[PDB]
Amino acid sequence: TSDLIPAPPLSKVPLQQNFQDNQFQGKWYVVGLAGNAILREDKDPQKMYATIYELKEDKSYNVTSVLFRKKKCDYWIRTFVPGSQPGEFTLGNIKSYPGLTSYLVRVVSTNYNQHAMVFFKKVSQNREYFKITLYGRTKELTSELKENFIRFSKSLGLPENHIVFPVPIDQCID
Ligand SMILES: COC(=O)[C@H](COC=O)NC(=O)c1cccc(O)c1O
Ligand SMILES: [Pu+4]
């Protein structure tokens, strides 16, 4: 049993015009995170983590997320393969994730050198999940950018308790 806010139609999710794959590379901090399986937890608030994008020769990204958990740095590695238009991706080797039948990434907006918003949708054990990340090249972003992220998240049907701003840390992600 679970109950989820439905994924929005893709028509409600903009795509960054003229996406530049080379400029999107490098480290991004997760300054904001929202989704139908994301919940604000005041007892142990979510810690900031980072995601590093590297273009391979074949123009897919190697994507590495690094998180501080149980006193250690944990690394999650995957491959984003260019999809139907620039700024969209599917997940490489999807078969090695049990139960995962669908995975889509769309870069919603970015100026490359400070901030981005990225939309993700997956189907896992037949359940449809989605999330939006607010990425920063630094660990803080302006109020304006955070409010825009909240506005965008709500437009996709998410209430405030499904929107979190992970707390900056120094372990692992420096
Ligand atoms: C069982 O709960 C989950 O499935 C987790 C929740 O935490 C996400 O960081 N993932 C997602 O909700 C999710 C959604 C879209 C794309 C992804 O890669 C995700 O991990
Ligand atoms: Pu995931």
Curated annotation (Swiss-Prot):
This protein's record includes keyword Glycoprotein: yes
Amino-acid positions noted as binding a carboxymycobactin in the UniProt annotation, renumbered to this chain: 49-51, 122, 131, 135
Keywords: Apoptosis, Cytoplasmic vesicle, Disulfide bond, Glycoprotein, Immunity, Innate immunity, Ion transport, Iron, Iron transport, Pyrrolidone carboxylic acid, Secreted, Signal, Transport
Cystine pairs: 73-172
Major location category of this protein: secreted
This protein's GO CC annotations: extracellular exosome; extracellular region; extracellular space; specific granule lumen
CDD domains recorded: lipocalin_2-like
Entry GO MF terms: enterobactin binding; identical protein binding; iron ion binding; iron ion sequestering activity; protease binding
Stimuli inducing this protein: Expression is activated by the oncoprotein BCR-ABL; BCR-ABL misregulates expression via the JAK/STAT pathway and binding of STAT5A to the promoter. Induced by insulin.
Superkingdom of source: Eukaryota
Biological processes annotated in GO: acute-phase response; cellular response to amyloid-beta; cellular response to hydrogen peroxide; cellular response to hypoxia; cellular response to increased oxygen levels; cellular response to interleukin-1; cellular response to interleukin-6; cellular response to lipopolysaccharide
Positions of glycan attachment: 62
Tissue expression profile of the protein: Detected in neutrophils (at protein level). Expressed in bone marrow and in tissues that are prone to exposure to microorganism. High expression is found in bone marrow as well as in uterus, prostate, salivary gland, stomach, appendix, colon, trachea and lung. Expressed in the medullary tubules of the kidney. Not found in the small intestine or peripheral blood leukocytes.
Binding site for enterobactin: 103, 131
InterPro entries: Calycin, LCN2/LCN12, Lipocalin, Lipocalin_CS, Lipocln_cytosolic_FA-bd_dom
Record keyword Hydrolase present: no
Compartments it resides in: Secreted; Cytoplasmic granule lumen; Cytoplasmic vesicle lumen
Family statement drawn from the similarity comment of this UniProt entry: Belongs to the calycin superfamily. Lipocalin family.
Function statement: Iron-trafficking protein involved in multiple processes such as apoptosis, innate immunity and renal development. Binds iron through association with 2,3-dihydroxybenzoic acid (2,3-DHBA), a siderophore that shares structural similarities with bacterial enterobactin, and delivers or removes iron from the cell, depending on the context. Iron-bound form (holo-24p3) is internalized following binding to the SLC22A17 (24p3R) receptor, leading to release of iron and subsequent increase of intracellular iron concentration.
Subunit structure: Monomer. Homodimer; disulfide-linked. Heterodimer; disulfide-linked with MMP9.
Protein name: Neutrophil gelatinase-associated lipocalin
Record gene name: LCN2
